[PDB]
């Protein structure tokens, strides 16, 4: 079609053949000082997420108005402490927690965020931001408020000297650098079929389906244990080495590996394999993100775990992923979710995952390069 806003932006056109690598336009050496204008009656407010009352306003905005699945049955329900993990990693800036309030009532009705990240894209490493948590209240939809939040976070990032971004979305925009399908692995099929996340096969009874997805009570790989503070350097080494094989990846410092992987109950889990010699040789990780089961009288919340970064050097990836499913089931999850990026297609079908119904598209702002297969994408955003 045409894209009234995105056709104005430094991104390649949909259908554009890209053979080159580099910025769409130059670094700016004068940047707009004034904020963009919202519609009348709304104002900007930078949200101090260290204030418990303001963090709870953001939690309510997203709980009521954030991403739903393609059937409008489940809505993400990020916890307040999860939002602090995703929004205050090393190098976060207060002006990059960008809220929109109704002037009279003060109600929070919009948000968008940026966090810094060093990104490796083919043969270039650049300091970028990751854009996430763009949300407009349901009563304000389709009034072109989202382009104002996108231009305003772009301005605030340009003031800090950054001219590229990475972001994901379930919608097609000019122009995906990679396209990933999500898959799911049932852990509690009775509840998944009750809430109609899943359906009972015409060729399987409930008994048989419970048996098909049943898992061992403890993981198979010897020496698996939670990551501890003494493991931060070796997790950093393992991840850095492992990610070199992909074409779009983060470059994390040792402090960022501590932030993104050190376990926090009900937010992030990381388990390392420590061999007979005391050496850590592998790790698996997954984050906790429930979904509200919209308008349902009985079960209110779907407990979902999401595959994060999984690094294998001595344990087969298939066994590490089996370990992850066992652990998730022990921790009371209903479903484990994963995308088809990195080496994930080597295990999805073998471990009984089923393919979902939509795409998570990956995008770069102000960076032209060839698109890549899902197997070459090595970056996961919450
Ligand atoms: C150098 C620094 C650069 C930094 C910035 C880099 C770019 C960052 C970009 C943002 C990365 C976000 C990453 C995440 O957080 S992905 C998660 C996005 N959030 C949700 O899906 C939550 C539920 N939905 C909503 O809250 C609203 O429907 C949103 C806010 C998504 C759109 O609000 P609304 O439905 O009321 O629409 P509008 O009338 O105001 O605006 C319509 C225009 O908006 C374009 N649109 C729709 N959805 C998206 C989307 N997910 N990314 C980018 N553009 C989007 C659309 O094609 C149209 O443009 P054009 O077709 O006319 O051209
Ligand atoms: C369950 C369920 N609850 N909901 C609300 C959806 C979209 C599902 C389907 C599974 O979706 C997934 C399953 C995966 F294994 C990985 C990712 C997603 C997914 C899909 C669309 C998204 N849009 N914004 C984000 C947030 N962030 C990455 C920018 C999304 C995350
Ligand atoms: Mg709008």
Curated annotation (Swiss-Prot):
Molecular function GO labels: glycylpeptide N-tetradecanoyltransferase activity; myristoyltransferase activity; peptidyl-lysine N6-myristoyltransferase activity
EC number: 2.3.1.97, 2.3.1.-
Entry annotated with the keyword Nucleotidyltransferase: no
Impact upon substituting residue 67 to L: Reduced glycine N-myristoyltransferase activity
Amino-acid positions noted as binding tetradecanoyl-CoA in the UniProt annotation, renumbered to this chain: 4-6, 133-136, 142, 144-146
Subcellular location: Cytoplasm; Cytoplasm, Cytosol; Membrane
Primary location recorded for the protein, binned into one broad class: cytoplasm
Effect on the protein upon substituting residue 78 to A: Reduced glycine N-myristoyltransferase activity
Tissues in which the protein is found: Heart, gut, kidney, liver and placenta.
Keywords carried by this UniProt record: Acyltransferase, Cytoplasm, Membrane, Phosphoprotein, Transferase
UniProt keyword annotation of Glycoprotein present: no
Impact upon substituting residue 66 to P: Abolished glycine- and lysine-myristoyltransferase activities
One example of a Gene Ontology biological process annotation: in utero embryonic development
Entry membrane topology: Peripheral membrane protein
Enzyme class: transferase
Residues spanning the membrane: none
Catalytic function, reaction form: N-terminal glycyl-[protein] + tetradecanoyl-CoA = N-tetradecanoylglycyl-[protein] + CoA + H(+); N-terminal glycyl-L-lysyl-[protein] + tetradecanoyl-CoA = N-terminal glycyl-(N(6)-tetradecanoyl)-L-lysyl-[protein] + CoA + H(+)
Assigned GO CC terms: cytoplasm; cytosol; plasma membrane
Effect on the protein of changing residue 378 to D/K: Reduced activity
Biological function: Adds a myristoyl group to the N-terminal glycine residue of certain cellular and viral proteins. Also able to mediate N-terminal lysine myristoylation of proteins: catalyzes myristoylation of ARF6 on both 'Gly-2' and 'Lys-3'. Lysine myristoylation is required to maintain ARF6 on membranes during the GTPase cycle.
Record-stated family: Belongs to the NMT family.
Protein's UniProt name: Glycylpeptide N-tetradecanoyltransferase 1
Lineage: Eukaryota, Metazoa, Chordata, Craniata, Vertebrata
Gene behind this protein: NMT1
Portion of the parent chain present: 115 to 496 of 496
